[PDB]
Amino acid sequence: KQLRGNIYLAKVTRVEPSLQAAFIEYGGNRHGFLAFNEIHPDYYQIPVADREALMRDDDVEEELARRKRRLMRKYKIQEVIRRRQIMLVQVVKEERGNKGAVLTTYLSLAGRYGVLMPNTARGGGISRKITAVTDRKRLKSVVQSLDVPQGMGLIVRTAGAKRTKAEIKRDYEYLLRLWENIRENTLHSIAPALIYEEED
């Protein structure tokens, strides 16, 4: 049983200020590892008017890179995360023997033609196999019209380059509903619970 891609509702078992990491009970054989920089600010224990002065930011992936680097300079994990806290976590790397799974709170949900990041203010854009100029200008126009919310991203994968006008809107819409489903499952779940299973 490979677990990569699965999403669990999970609980902080201990916070390790030397590693700037938290260890996570998510239902597996060993605790998962969650580096501080993989922890979405929604999970910070900070006043609501700090978490806002911070969502609005104080290869355009650098703007997001600088963003995370801002947080890591500004807080230490033990200032903002505590034992027993609950979070949604996704498996990034499989548990290998005695070593527990590597986790993130920056989720991604992969559809046929694209990947939704319901957690990453990244706006939506195109795979690095972005090559043939025609598709890339066309697709940028396509992902442009999607009106990707707020603090989400959508990345068009290569399966979508040679893809329908609206085969991509459908696929995107399916992922938005699946994100809704996930958030709804979490309100009816406790502690460690599998919330979404990486389908294929």
Numbering used by the authors: 36 to 93, 129 to 270
Task: Quote the original article.
One of the key enzymes of RNA processing and decay in numerous bacterial species is the endoribonuclease RNase E. In addition to its well characterized hydrolytic nuclease activity, RNase E also acts as a molecular hub that co-ordinates the formation of a multi-enzyme assembly termed the RNA degradosome. The protomer of EcNTD can be divided into large and small domains, which are connected by a pair of conserved CPxCxGxG motifs that co-ordinate a zinc ion. Within the large domain, four sub-domains can be further assigned based on function and similarity to homologous structural folds, namely RNase H, DNase I, S1 and 5′-sensor. However, the only significant deviation from conservation of this domain is a highly diverse insertion within the S1 domain in members of the α-proteobacteria and plants.
The CcNTD1–575 construct was crystallized and x-ray diffraction data were collected to 2.1 Å resolution. The portions of the S1 insert that could be modelled are on the surface of the tetramer and are solvent exposed. From the crystal structure of CcNTD1–274 presented here it appears that the partially helical S1 insert occupies the area where RNA is bound in the E. coli RNase E structure.
